Chain A
């Protein structure tokens, strides 16, 4: 999920957008 993707490693703006509604 989000922690592993964007905290543990790094997320691009596009990857962050996966968590929007």
Chain B
């Protein structure tokens, strides 16, 4: 896997991919 700062929509797409059918929760606050 990439070794880097993942921010914004890049973070979200990383989650989408890694999580599969499980889905994810994105809570940045």
Contact = CB atoms under 8 A, between A and B. Distances in A.
A8 B7 CA distance: 8
Main SS of the interface on chain A?
Answer: helix
Contacts of A9: 5
A2 B29 CA distance: 9
Given A19-B15, A20-B18, A6 B26 contact: no
Interface residues of A, number: 16
A19 B22 CA distance: 10
Interface of B: 1, 3-8, 11, 14-15, 18-20, 22-29
Interface of A: 1-3, 6-13, 16-17, 19-21
